[PDB]
Amino acid sequence: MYTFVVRDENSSVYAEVSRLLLATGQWKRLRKDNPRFNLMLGERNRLPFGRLGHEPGLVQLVNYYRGADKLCRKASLVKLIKTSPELSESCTWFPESYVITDEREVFLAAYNRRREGGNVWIAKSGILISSEASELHVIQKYLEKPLLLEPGHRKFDIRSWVLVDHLYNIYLYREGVLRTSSEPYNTCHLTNHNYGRYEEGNEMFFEEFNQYLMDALNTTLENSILLQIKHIIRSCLMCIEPAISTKHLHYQSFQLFGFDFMVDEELKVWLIEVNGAPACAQKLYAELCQGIVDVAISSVFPLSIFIKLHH
Amino acid sequence: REIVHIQAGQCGNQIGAKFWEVISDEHGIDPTGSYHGDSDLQLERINVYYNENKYVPRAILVDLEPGTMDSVRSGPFGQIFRPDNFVFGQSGAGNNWAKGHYTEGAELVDSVLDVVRKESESCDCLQGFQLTHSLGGGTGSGMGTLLISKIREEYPDRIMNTFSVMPSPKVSDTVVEPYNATLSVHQLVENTDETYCIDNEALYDICFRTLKLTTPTYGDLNHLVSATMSGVTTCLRFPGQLNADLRKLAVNMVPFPRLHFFMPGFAPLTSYRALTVPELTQQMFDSKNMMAACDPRHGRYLTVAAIFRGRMSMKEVDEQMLNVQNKNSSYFVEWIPNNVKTAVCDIPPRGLKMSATFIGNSTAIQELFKRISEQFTAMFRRKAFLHWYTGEGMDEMEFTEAESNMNDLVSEYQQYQDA
Amino acid sequence: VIELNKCTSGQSFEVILKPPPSLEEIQKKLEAAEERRKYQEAELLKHLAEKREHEREV
Amino acid sequence: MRECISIHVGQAGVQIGNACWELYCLEHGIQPDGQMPSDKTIGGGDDSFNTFFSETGAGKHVPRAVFVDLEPTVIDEVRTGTYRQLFHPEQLITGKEDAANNYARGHYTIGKEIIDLVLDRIRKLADQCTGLQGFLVFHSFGGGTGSGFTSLLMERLSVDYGKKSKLEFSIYPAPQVSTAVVEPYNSILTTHTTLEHSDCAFMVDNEAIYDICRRNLDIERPTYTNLNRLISQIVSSITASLRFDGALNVDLTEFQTNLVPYPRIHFPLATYAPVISAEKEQLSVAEITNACFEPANQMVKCDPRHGKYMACCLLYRGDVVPKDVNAAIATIKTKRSIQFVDWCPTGFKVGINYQPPTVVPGGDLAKVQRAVCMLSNTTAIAEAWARLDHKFDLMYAKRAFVHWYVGEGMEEGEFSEAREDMAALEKDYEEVGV
Numbered sequence A: 001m002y003t004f005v006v007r008d009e010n011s012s013v014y015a016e017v018s019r020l021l022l023a024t025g026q027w028k029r030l031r032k033d034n035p036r037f038n039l040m041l042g043e044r045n046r047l048p049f050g051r052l053g054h055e056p057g058l059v060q061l062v063n064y065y066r067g068a069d070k071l072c073r074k075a076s077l078v079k080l081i082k083t084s085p086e087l088s089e090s091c092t093w094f095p096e097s098y099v100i101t102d103e104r105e106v107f108l109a110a111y112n113r114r115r116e117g118g119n120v121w122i123a124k125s126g127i128l129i130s131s132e133a134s135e136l137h138v139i140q141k142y143l144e145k146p147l148l149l150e151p152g153h154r155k156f157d158i159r160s161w162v163l164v165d166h167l168y169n170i171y172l173y174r175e176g177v178l179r180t181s182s183e184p185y186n187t188c189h190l191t192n193h194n195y196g197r198y199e200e201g202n203e204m205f206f207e208e209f210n211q212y213l214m215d216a217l218n219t220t221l222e223n224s225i226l227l228q229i230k231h232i233i234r235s236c237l238m239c240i241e242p243a244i245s246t247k248h249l250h251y252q253s254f255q256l257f258g259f260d261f262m263v264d265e266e267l268k269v270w271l272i273e274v275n276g277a278p279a280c281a282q283k284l285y286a287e288l289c290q291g292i293v294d295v296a297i298s299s300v301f302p303l304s305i306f307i308k309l310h311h
Numbered sequence B: 001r002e003i004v005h006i007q008a009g010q011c012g013n014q015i016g017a018k019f020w021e022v023i024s025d026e027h028g029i030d031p032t033g034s035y036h037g038d039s040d041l042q043l044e045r046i047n048v049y050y051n052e053n054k055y056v057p058r059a060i061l062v063d064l065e066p067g068t069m070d071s072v073r074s075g076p077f078g079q080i081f082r083p084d085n086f087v088f089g090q091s092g093a094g095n096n097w098a099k100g101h102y103t104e105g106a107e108l109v110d111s112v113l114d115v116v117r118k119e120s121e122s123c124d125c126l127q128g129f130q131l132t133h134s135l136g137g138g139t140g141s142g143m144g145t146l147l148i149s150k151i152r153e154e155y156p157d158r159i160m161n162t163f164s165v166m167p168s169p170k171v172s173d174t175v176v177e178p179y180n181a182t183l184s185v186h187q188l189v190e191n192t193d194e195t196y197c198i199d200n201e202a203l204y205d206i207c208f209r210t211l212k213l214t215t216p217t218y219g220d221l222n223h224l225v226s227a228t229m230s231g232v233t234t235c236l237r238f239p240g241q242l243n244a245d246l247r248k249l250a251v252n253m254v255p256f257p258r259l260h261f262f263m264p265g266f267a268p269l270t271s272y273r274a275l276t277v278p279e280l281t282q283q284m285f286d287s288k289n290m291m292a293a294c295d296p297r298h299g300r301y302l303t304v305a306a307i308f309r310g311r312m313s314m315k316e317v318d319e320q321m322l323n324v325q326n327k328n329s330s331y332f333v334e335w336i337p338n339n340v341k342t343a344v345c346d347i348p349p350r351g352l353k354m355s356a357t358f359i360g361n362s363t364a365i366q367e368l369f370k371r372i373s374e375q376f377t378a379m380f381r382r383k384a385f386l387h388w389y390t391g392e393g394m395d396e397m398e399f400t401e402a403e404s405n406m407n408d409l410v411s412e413y414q415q416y417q418d419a
Numbered sequence C: 001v002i003e004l005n006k007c008t009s010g011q012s013f014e015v016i017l018k019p020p021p022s023l024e025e026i027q028k029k030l031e032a033a034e035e036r037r038k039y040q041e042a043e044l045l046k047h048l049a050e051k052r053e054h055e056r057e058v
Numbered sequence D: 001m002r003e004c005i006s007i008h009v010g011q012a013g014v015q016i017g018n019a020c021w022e023l024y025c026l027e028h029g030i031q032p033d034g035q036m037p038s039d040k041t042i043g044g045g046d047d048s049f050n051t052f053f054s055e056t057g058a059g060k061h062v063p064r065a066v067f068v069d070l071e072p073t074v075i076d077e078v079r080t081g082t083y084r085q086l087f088h089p090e091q092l093i094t095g096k097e098d099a100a101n102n103y104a105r106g107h108y109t110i111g112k113e114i115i116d117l118v119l120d121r122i123r124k125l126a127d128q129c130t131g132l133q134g135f136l137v138f139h140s141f142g143g144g145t146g147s148g149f150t151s152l153l154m155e156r157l158s159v160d161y162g163k164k165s166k167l168e169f170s171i172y173p174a175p176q177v178s179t180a181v182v183e184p185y186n187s188i189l190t191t192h193t194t195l196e197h198s199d200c201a202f203m204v205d206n207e208a209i210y211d212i213c214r215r216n217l218d219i220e221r222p223t224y225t226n227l228n229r230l231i232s233q234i235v236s237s238i239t240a241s242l243r244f245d246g247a248l249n250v251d252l253t254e255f256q257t258n259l260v261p262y263p264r265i266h267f268p269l270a271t272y273a274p275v276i277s278a279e280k281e282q283l284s285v286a287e288i289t290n291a292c293f294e295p296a297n298q299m300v301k302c303d304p305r306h307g308k309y310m311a312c313c314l315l316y317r318g319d320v321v322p323k324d325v326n327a328a329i330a331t332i333k334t335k336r337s338i339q340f341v342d343w344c345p346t347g348f349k350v351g352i353n354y355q356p357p358t359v360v361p362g363g364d365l366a367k368v369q370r371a372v373c374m375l376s377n378t379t380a381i382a383e384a385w386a387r388l389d390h391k392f393d394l395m396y397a398k399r400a401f402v403h404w405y406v407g408e409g410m411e412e413g414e415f416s417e418a419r420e421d422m423a424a425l426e427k428d429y430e431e432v433g434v
Ligand SMILES: *[C@H]1CC(=O)C/C(C)=C\C=C\C(=O)O[C@H]([C@H](O)NC(=O)/C=C\C=C\C)C/C(C)=C/[C@@H]2CSC[C@H](C1)O2
Pocket: B022, B211, B223, B224, B226, B227, B230, B268, B269, B270, B271, B272, B273, B274, B275, B349, B350, B351, B352
């Protein structure tokens, strides 16, 4: 019998992992504060990483990488990209961004240069999209030329789910989702969940998107977009590996990340953000959650939907 | 350093005699008190139990009639005891706590204290006392608890430990045992630091069901007991780190002062084959190897001490002890971190290559007090058999008070079981 | 590298990668604790004395 | 030359002390009878090794040490063991009955009755010093003597030697070898009462040492003997600067200056490499230095990547030259997560002693050509305080075992006061480390 504890009651992903574990017949759920667990499904804030890996005779695993917040907060991602040489200030796949020490004067200088020669930016940390510096946390270049789905002239973003195991294998779940606007593009600007007119729940899955890319643009999802998604995922996660790896540590970590991308009308992919505690689309819970159990948990506690991004 | 041992009444002297035979054999001491062993481990801590080229038990033998102590003196190791340490009257206690505690026992107790004092006074640094008795009769129960109270008054900063045999209707001499045990438990709650609760019904059922003895005698039961007493005193009597003295044991085992009643256990108990550390460990934690007739799965462990004896892998011991805790973690209160401690002594008991002894402070011990409480009430509601007690000067109010105090103890265990 | 000293036993140096109660109070605490121990023992002995009176009554 | 007096309190303090003095003898060429044939000044002198050893007219080299324990069996081993002729009886103090794993019994009940005798024996050592620097105090956190007696002693030393430094070598509790359920209480009580009296404390977690012994020395079930031999090597690395010629950490006050810019945050993390089995290919300067950033080699398991550094000292023994040290640091900075606080410089103080580590003949540790002990003051060691404080909280919330302490005359409020100090400590580390 393996033991685990549940510390984030609100995680739809870990509620399902927990159900799955219990249904194996080989895992038992302990009360939240019993220290004699194999597996912690941890709380989202101040997870007490300092109390892990000090239980004689128990291999202990947690579903968060300590330090991974550096990728998963807007302003810390901006700083990570600008201050890491492997990512760098000139990184071609992350929009020009400023943290608002503050980079306000650097922002202004870039804004003015451009105004002298498209100058829409987006403030976020409550979102504002504007042409005027004055009206305008992070300030980021707003992608003025998005790829628009037809029919309906509509914006979208891509969510990719990524699982990083205890060995720092990086696995890209083979199903992603497009979250679409169902308003024609200049609510038409922000693709956060005519609602449901083109697709159920304003989500388009990869089979349909690929079919659309073949029919309308004479290319594939693989070639036009996933090569770049994979590159970006690997680049981000390889960058923080020395700071967060649990390879020689007294406890081990895995974590599920939700990476969000925009595609421009030249089929260039841009990273928008990394989510450290994602939800999953309704119809993909069962498959993803079982993948989590197979690759992240049962790999460590013996009883493919994933592309392994090699490095 | 030194412990002073007291054995009172029939049960107390019978099990006490067996304890001394068994530990004398382990320490290489023959019936004439001469040492004839072959390991220095035997002698390193001998003075804990023996005065000194002869070794004499630090043991005082008490009764209100001479017969059991006559048998002790004739029995196997009977000549090893100091003759001045036999203190006994003639009239008996008639299975009556009041006779032991208030009338007959009162006439003899000062002479017992004289001997206690003489043994205490030649101790370099007395740690405290261990008493063997039953709670169901008169002398061990009534006079034994009188002694405990008098010792506490004269040595209030020393530890008091008892091996207390608890009565059962299934292995019973008289109907008044629940009265005598309830009156005694009230004393133990206030005046001992550590009481090993040994249930006669558990001993019987172990002998009958596990050991396949068709008709157990008191002799059979006492064999069990003396094995367990040997196991539980191992860390007092041999070199080691953990629970090496009475006060250290109490600090590790007793989180609240009243909750000092322990369920002991022994492994192996089977009807030549090698025993594995896995088997010892699993048997030690099984209800059928425990001596209080309470199911530990009906409560939680506040604290546990485990002692392994024999040549065996220390690594595999640590491993199996962690397996049991990690696998059954719900039966261990979570608000006492690391509440199971393990000791290992190289010397096995006679006849065994390997053994283990368990001492649990479990809230399930409530079941033993509840049983005694129910048997007390069934009689006391009709004031049955009370004339034996009132004729010695006691009032009904003292029975009401003992009953309440024991019910209070039951509630206290329940509280921590739920916490 | 700054502050290099050398001797026949070894050397040492510094490398910079970047700049930027009284006796009386103790004695009283120990006595106050001893007094609490004594109080607690006196209470015990009082309780034992009451038990002895009861024994004599019976 | 300025003397240092070592004080060994309780079982752990005494057994570690024994291991340390034996190793010191072997490092300095001092025989079990106290004779030191290489020392050409007979009956006196002011060499570096004289910081730890006085000399008699007969040429005996005597540890500047006191051993104190509340029961006799551990010190009796010193009295009768290999190095027995090194010590005189007045250096060896024993009572009859111990503190039963109870800080209050050690501090209040038994401590009151032996503290004066201990001070008189320390004073006899002090009176032989021309320029006493202060004290090195070795004890457990978990034991009743190591916890409770040490904190009384530390308070009384601040009164009688108010200008002297006091360093600690403290054994943090680990359930794999611990002997009491109440060790978290003892730890927190003693840390609260000692905090203002100690200038620098080196905590060693028995869990970390046990694991190093299991993994690197291939010992399946380490004994205190195994553990204490490793600990003595680390201790010797740390005190080597006091006992040999050198320009780094040559007096007790420099420990504070170099490692402790904020007085309450005075617990440097020691990391040691290499640890190689005697029964079992020689590591370079680069490899041993890189190993100092590995949690597995630390005396307390914690993650420095997720705190900040206030100071970092590298202490090398054996065949090491500055050039190779600097090249190693260069490499490691480009690979590892080493963030200093903003108000201290980013850099390392380095000491090299050319004599490689001595090992005890037929011990478990192989002889190596070079070894290093890194002392870093990182906020990550606060993980250990979090761990302890949480254990304390679980038991204290039900008042489990409190009656044993109250019954020795401690007030219950001393628990909550000690705990509140620890909470302020955790917050001090968080504020520095954010
Ligand atoms: C008392 C023994 C005595 O009077 C008679 C004999 C010959 C044996 C009694 C043995 C006994 O009770 O053994 C139990 C247990 O049944 N033994 C085993 O399970 C053995 C092997 C298991 C393998 C799978 C153990 C016991 C209580 C022994 C004690 C030790 S202390 C001294 C007494 C002697 O025996």
